[PDB]
Write a protein that binds this ligand. Structure first.
Ligand SMILES: *[C@@H]1O[C@H](CO[C@@H]2O[C@@H](C)[C@@H](O)[C@@H](O)[C@@H]2O)[C@@H](O[C@@H]2O[C@H](CO)[C@@H](O)[C@H](O)[C@H]2NC(C)=O)[C@H](O)[C@H]1NC(C)=O
Ligand SMILES: *[C@@H]1O[C@H](CO[C@@H]2O[C@@H](C)[C@@H](O)[C@@H](O)[C@@H]2O)[C@@H](O[C@@H]2O[C@H](CO)[C@@H](O)[C@H](O)[C@H]2NC(C)=O)[C@H](O)[C@H]1NC(C)=O
Ligand SMILES: *[C@@H]1O[C@H](CO[C@@H]2O[C@@H](C)[C@@H](O)[C@@H](O)[C@@H]2O)[C@@H](O[C@@H]2O[C@H](CO)[C@@H](O)[C@H](O)[C@H]2NC(C)=O)[C@H](O)[C@H]1NC(C)=O
Ligand SMILES: *[P@](=O)(/N=C(\C)N(CC)CC)OCC
Ligand SMILES: CCO[P@@H](=O)/N=C(\C)N(CC)CC
Lengths: 529, 532
């Protein structure tokens, strides 16, 4: 009966499991309840702290995945199934996981806290690609990851109402961060050295905790991978949030009091809400999600973009970056002429049609400005160039330029910023070659998944993964990824970043500076007049 | 006695010319042929009336007066500016034309080249040294004609709808000269069935307007547009703005002491010509470069619609045109008002001066339009580099006013049935007096087209004399056949391939795109922005 796997937290006693890695054992505590189950009357409500328990909670296996849409675009395809739930769906899903070295550390060790992505409509801390055992063994850190409510269950908002205030999925994350502050020392973690990191909507979540004062005291450093809180998909206004919530109620046979409305929604099975989730969007689109954080003055006192411009970020260190081809993944989900199973050599007409889908809810004039900038007017109809251009449109608008704006504003306002572009295409990648390095496929290297012997990564890849784990952990420990070729900080003027691939670090200038000047500087002025 | 080669009878009466010496042999020149009644006194602002017949022999032996115009004083005594200033006395009695013909007179009908000078519709003269037609005629055996036309208020002041000052009379001066060519050029040996118009800057815009005006279209067969287009943002003005500028000029000179148009023009006609010139520039609505007070007006008569509309909607089958630009169209105009610019220093401007220059180089556009210009012409990896900013503002002014209007005209004509040839002139003359940073400025291909390097009193290199002879051959080949190529090839310009040739001391090099990325902004996007 192993004392290393027995831990007492404030709520009671836990029993963990000893996990094997190629580098030696790891202690894991999986499925720790940090909130009361948000069931029945608690649906749509802020999380409530988990009440204490007697006896020993079995923390030896992942708990349920929060209720979410399950992707069916390519059934059985590894490229999509790796993101789908690998545990049963349940609204009883507010659990977190702790990985720690074996034996448990006696002195405080820096803590890494992972927030998964998935467009605020999906995701789980139990996915194979988020396995924390390799990072913990290799870099001697404590790693924490939590489940948080997604879709309507986490972000349906009737603003001003108590029954459905919105942003409760963000409050799930905050409660887990508060849990870390109060309990991580029992596992050997240092609550005074907590580094948030997340990808896609998880990166947008990290940025929103940066911009919400009640969350700012719960961590010390931040890593934003391929996502930003100022992304055009990451927040929604109060009026549009109310419209989407009201439209969902109509679609599921629900009725006008906000109270009556939510009460009827609470009688519906969770799967029924999921089945109508995508139908409340105003337009046919890619890279848009129905229920996302709402700007209502509470969690976010203003839009993330306003909060970024007006903040004093002295004393903050951030690590941000993007993959080489942020836009390609999303094109197969609705852009005309695109598929993972052919070359997606689109025509000019399909390109123009894709622009309206990839840049939804903008005026015709705004769309024409997009076409002007992303057309090569010496080769206006070349299919290969059009395919690459539409990928750039979607990737720049939704990921690269929001990340570039956040990096530049934080750096100019006192933060130390390190920026990267991930440019290695995994030898095991199942997506076609034309997609390049797609969104989300740096994660497996950050987590050291290539070190798993049962996988088919090359020897060079394993060394690459170990390099990236060292950068990320160096940043967690010191706020500086460099090993004491150097990685210089990103600044609004020099705009320096490094490329991450099998070659040594290469310093370059500009995160798509010409393109992002369009999205970040001109287009806001066009839309306002 | 008399040299029969220098005696010609036209419809108005008899003329006596002069024999000119050229390095290649003699040429007959008839300079100062009256083609209209002098538009003086009551005839000021009125359409030209044909010159009434005369008895005896008119001596057409020297250039006549320059039409009344502003005289540039930016760099007094400087060759780069003085070469464009009048070289004859100013007078409203200025409606004369010139004919150069080979000596002896041609035996069979010879193709005719007709030159229309530029000068922003406010200046210019057919008598400038750089327009000397003796070298083209001797080298290529063509007949060359050039005319004076009224400029400034005298040629383009418009009170639209008014009978006393209808506007566009300077264009009617050009048309009357073209009608004179049809009726009389055969007496000099010229072929009235093979007439090629060519002009530069506002002369090129004038050529394009004759292409788009049916009464002029029957008077010529081919066109050459050098560094100018009728669809340039400076080349035409609306009816209301023309009336506002004309009314403001009258107000500035004490007329009336608006109101009745007849009375208004009658008061203007009592003012000395120099008094009108002295107030010409004060009627512009905004501080700017590349904008001129009195230009052709779109009033439904000479131009039934805007040139852009007429170009987009026209059928141009059976037409051959040659168009082109110099390498640095914008640089010349920057020293005339862009902050931080001068011919006497490097003009390495700051970011603030660049932003200020954009409003001067793109006048009368909304703040949003100006922001679009700044977005496009800023290198956001080097947003404050002075050298890059200087080059960028030159591109802004050159693309907006010359390159992109020419590219739009070239693309639409080619797509709608015309045979188009396009060039970029990239040779900086060894004799150029402008600073090195200005590159190949606007207007400095003309001396090579006219073969000026062949003048023995000039100091051009031997390569430049060979170069000049190449260009004269291209232009005359086009005049004779509609194809500059010899009976390295010059391919036609098309809306898709967008092929043009570089003209310099090296052989022809074929390239693609007349600043396609930049001109997509000016020609395709910016119009949509201004309408919303
Ligand atoms: C590339 O594929 C897309 C997607 O089509 C699907 O996948 C293909 C592998 C094939 O099995 C198709 O039959 C599938 O529908 C093609 O775009 C579709 O084209 C059809 C016309 O044949 C049209 O009815 C659909 O609406 C199109 N779908 C989308 C999303 O645009 C595309 O034509 C293929 N490119 C080729 C073949 O060059
Ligand atoms: C605008 O004024 C003209 C000119 O009026 C003439 O000149 C003034 C100085 C004054 O002496 C008037 O008495 C003159 O008549 C008008 O054109 C004249 O119209 C009359 C009547 O139809 C005619 O007999 C004259 O020949 C015209 N003179 C011309 C054409 O030179 C014109 O009608 C006025 N328009 C208005 C007031 O709208
Ligand atoms: C480059 O020259 C301009 C023009 O100034 C004139 O020309 C210069 C060559 C020199 O002879 C000056 O004395 C002339 O006044 C400079 O811009 C001017 O700067 C002065 C004061 O420095 C100001 O009063 C004028 O308004 C400016 N004019 C314009 C059009 O901006 C410019 O500063 C010079 N650049 C240098 C020296 O780097
Ligand atoms: P992100 O939330 N993340 C996505 C789509 N992902 C699958 C590749 C990683 C979990 O994108 C929407 C912002
Ligand atoms: C539209 C303004 O440009 P154009 O009229 N021509 C110019 C300025 N010159 C002087 C270099 C040639 C006569």
């Amino acid at each position: 009966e192993d004392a290393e796997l027995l831990v007492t937290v404030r709520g009671g006693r836990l029993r963990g499991i000893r996990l094997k890695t190629p580098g030696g054992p790891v202690s894991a505590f999986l499925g720790i309840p940090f909130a009361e189950p948000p069931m029945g009357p608690r649906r749509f409500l802020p999380p409530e702290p988990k009440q204490p328990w007697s006896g020993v909670v079995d923390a030896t296996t992942f708990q349920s995945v929060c209720y979410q849409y399950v992707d069916t675009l390519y059934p059985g395809f590894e490229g999509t199934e790796m993101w789908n739930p690998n545990r049963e769906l349940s609204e009883d899903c507010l659990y977190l996981n702790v990985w720690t070295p074996y034996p448990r550390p006696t002195s405080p060790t820096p803590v890494l806290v992972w927030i998964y992505g998935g467009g605020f409509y999906s995701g789980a801390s139990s996915l194979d690609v988020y396995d924390g055992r390799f990072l913990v063994q290799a870099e001697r850190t404590v790693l924490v990851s939590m489940n948080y409510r997604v879709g309507a269950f986490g972000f349906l908002a009737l603003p001003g109402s108590r029954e459905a205030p919105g942003n409760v999925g963000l409050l799930d994350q905050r409660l887990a961060l508060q849990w870390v502050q109060e309990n991580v020392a029992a596992f050997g973690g240092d609550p005074t050295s907590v580094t948030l990191f997340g990808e896609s909507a998880g990166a947008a979540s990290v940025g929103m905790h940066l911009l919400s004062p009640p969350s700012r005291g719960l961590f010390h450093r931040a890593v934003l991978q391929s996502g930003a809180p100022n992304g055009p998909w990451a927040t929604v206004g109060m009026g549009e949030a109310r419209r989407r919530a009201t439209q969902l109620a109509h679609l599921v046979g629900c009725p006008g009091n906000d109270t009556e409305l939510v009460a009827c929604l609470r009688t519906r099975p969770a799967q029924v809400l999921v089945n109508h989730e995508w139908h409340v969007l105003p337009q046919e689109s890619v890279f848009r999600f129905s229920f996302v954080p709402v700007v209502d003055g509470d969690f976010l006192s203003d839009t993330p973009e306003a909060l970024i411009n007006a903040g004093d970020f002295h004393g903050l260190q951030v690590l941000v970056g993007v993959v080489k081809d942020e836009g390609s993944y999303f094109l197969v989900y609705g852009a005309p002429g695109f598929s993972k199973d052919n070359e997606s050599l689109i025509s000019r007409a399909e390109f123009l049609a894709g622009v309206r889908v990839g840049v939804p809810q903008v005026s015709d004039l705004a769309a024409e400005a997009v076409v002007l900038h992303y057309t090569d007017w010496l080769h206006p109809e070349d299919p290969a160039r059009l395919r690459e251009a539409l990928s750039d449109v979607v990737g720049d608008h939704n990921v690269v330029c929001p990340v570039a704006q956040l990096a530049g504003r934080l750096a100019a306002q006192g933060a130390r910023v390190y920026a990267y572009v991930f440019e290695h295409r995994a030898s095991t990648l199942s997506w076609p070659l034309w997609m390049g390095v797609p969104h989300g496929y740096e994660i497996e290297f950050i987590f050291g998944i290539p070190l798993d012997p049962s996988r088919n990564y090359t020897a060079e890849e394993k060394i690459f993964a170990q390099r990236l784990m060292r950068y990320w952990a160096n940043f967690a420990r010191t706020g500086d990824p460099n090993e004491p070729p150097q990685w210089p900080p990103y600044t609004a003027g020099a705009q320096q970043y490094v490329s991450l691939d099998l070659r040594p670090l290469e310093v370059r200038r500009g995160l798509r500076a010409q393109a992002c000047a369009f999205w970040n500087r001109f287009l806001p002025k066009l839309l306002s007049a």
